[PDB]
């Protein structure tokens, strides 16, 4: 039901003269845009990535971003000079900006900034602020950033109005991809455990979309409490991979089965017997 739209920017400044800025955009766990440093323009990564915006509305938005990217780059370089010698290159800056969409016309927007991998700054309300734990020297950059009334008005518009409107259209346009069902396929294997005498069984599950899934090692009807799910790992085709391990005694493998429940199967669970 709820979807988070995330624009993710990563900027690396190596020294006074070298830098790059690259962005990717996500609606839930599907990529909708990429903007490489080598590209003048933002790239769509789905047919529906323009949402419900007209070409004129999209061109205007892109132009605003094109001006931003160049301007942001000079601003960081000038801010470095301003705070010198307190901070120096190399510098890593990340921005996470977007909106989370709730039922009705409800949404919340955000714009969070990290410096050398730590969240230090957000835009909130009508201005930039530091967050708890941020270093004091940032108060000067914040004062300088908050002097720029034109940027404040534009960011307010982007967060309050543009983001939710754009994302509502994206959700409509992309409905069929967002609602896709792809089936897991499972397979079994085994390795030697940390302790001699034991073995570790592995139930591999791959190709499922969307993300929610249930995987348990089982002896008939008894769920094996020792089952350890790993992390969700991406496949290159926008499906997911997950494995569930179980440490057992060599000899006890017979009778064990791996059971997988997923929305795409329509109640026809996968059951793989060792």
């Amino acid at each position: 039901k709820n979807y988070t739209f995330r624009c993710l920017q990563m900027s690396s400044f190596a020294n006074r003269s070298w830098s790059r800025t690259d962005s990717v955009v996500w609606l839930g766990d599907l990529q909708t845009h990429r903007w490489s440093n080598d590209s003048a323009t933002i790239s769509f990564t789905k047919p529906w990535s323009q949402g419900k915006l007209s070409n004129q509305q999209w061109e205007k938005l892109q132009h605003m971003f094109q001006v931003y990217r160049v301007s942001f780059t000079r601003d960081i370089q000038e801010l470095v000079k301003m705070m010198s010698p307190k901070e120096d290159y190399p510098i890593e800056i990340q921005l996470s900006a977007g909106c989370e969409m709730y039922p009705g016309n409800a949404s919340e927007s955000f714009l969070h900034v990290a410096f050398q991998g730590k969240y230090v700054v957000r835009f909130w309300g009508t201005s930039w602020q530091t967050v708890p734990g941020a270093p004091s020297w940032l108060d000067l950059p914040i004062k300088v950033l908050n002097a720029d009334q034109g940027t404040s008005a534009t960011v307010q518009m982007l967060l309050n109005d543009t983001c939710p409107l754009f994302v509502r259209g994206l959700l409509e346009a992309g409905k069929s991809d967002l609602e896709k069902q792809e089936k897991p396929v499972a397979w079994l294997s085994s390795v030697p455990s940390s302790a001699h005498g034991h073995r570790q069984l592995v139930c591999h599950v791959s190709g499922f979309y969307p993300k929610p899934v249930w995987v348990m090692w089982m002896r008939g009807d008894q769920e094996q409490q020792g089952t350890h799910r790993g992390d969700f790992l991406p496949n290159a085709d926008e499906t997911w991979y997950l494995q569930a391990t179980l440490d057992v005694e060599a000899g006890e493998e017979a009778g064990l089965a791996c059971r997988v429940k997923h929305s795409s199967l329509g109640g026809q669970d996968i059951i793989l017997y060792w």
């Epitope: 601003d75 301003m82 010198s84 009334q149 034109g150």
Partner: T-cell receptor, first 113, second 111 residues
Framework: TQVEQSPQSLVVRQGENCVLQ??????????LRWFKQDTGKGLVSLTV?????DKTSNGRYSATLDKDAKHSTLHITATLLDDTATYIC?????????????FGAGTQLIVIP | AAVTQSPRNKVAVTGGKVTLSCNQT?????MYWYRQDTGHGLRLIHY???????EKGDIPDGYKASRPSQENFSLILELATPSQTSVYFC??????????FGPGTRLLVLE
């Protein structure tokens, strides 16, 4: 250059009105200022324009800015001898001290008393 | 918000050392040096974001900048040349975009 003024120079008679132009390619264009500079003196700010389509006035001086066209005009009504000066257009590329100012080379006005 | 410059006028010789000074009591962090020559708009030489900061502008070659305090920003021509005959303007400002200009210094460098 990024900021161009026209005419380069002009001569008018006292009481006549005139119009001075500034055209720029500066990006981004946060604001545009007009200065008056009397011969061998300093820079006196006449007006600053900040909006997408802006109009200002200050006594006998009035100005327009159209950011879409990247064009501004300064109008002097009922010229006086003391208007004899160079008039300079300056475009600031940020709304803060992170900005650079881009200066036009000026228009020389002579008013015959 | 005021800015003063000294000297107001200076005749120097090629190869000599010339120092142009700018003072402001506004507690402005930021100061800027420009030169104005016929046929050009003002052009930025050096600027500074605070005591101890000097940064190169668009035309820094042949000038050194010095910011010993919040109040004072100097432009130093170590080996003056005739091409440095100009009118020099200093400005200051705070975090806002406005630059507050001094009255100008006329320099002539003779052979």
């Amino acid at each position: 250059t990024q900021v161009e003024q026209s005419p380069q120079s002009l001569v008018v008679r006292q009481g006549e009105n005139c119009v001075l132009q500034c055209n720029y390619s500066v990006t981004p264009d946060n604001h545009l200022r007009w200065f008056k500079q009397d011969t061998g003196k300093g820079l006196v700010s006449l007006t600053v324009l900040v909006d997408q389509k802006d109009k200002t006035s200050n006594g006998r001086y009035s100005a327009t800015l159209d950011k879409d066209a990247k064009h501004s005009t300064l109008h002097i009504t009922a010229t006086l001898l003391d208007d004899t000066a160079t008039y300079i257009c300056v475009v600031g590329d940020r709304g803060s001290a992170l900005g650079r100012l881009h200066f036009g080379a000026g228009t020389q006005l002579i008013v015959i008393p | 918000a005021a800015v003063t410059q000294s000297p107001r006028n200076k005749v120097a010789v090629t190869g000599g050392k010339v120092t142009l000074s700018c003072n402001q009591t506004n507690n402005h962090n930021n100061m800027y040096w420009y030169r104005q020559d016929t046929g050009h708009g003002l052009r930025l030489i050096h600027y500074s974001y605070g005591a101890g900061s000097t940064e190169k502008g668009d035309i820094p070659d042949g000038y050194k900048a010095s910011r010993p305090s919040q109040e004072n920003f100097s432009l130093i021509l170590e080996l003056a040349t005739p091409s440095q005959t100009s009118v020099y303007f200093c400005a200051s400002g705070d975090e806002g975009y406005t630059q507050y200009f001094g009255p100008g210094t006329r320099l002539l460098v003779l052979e």
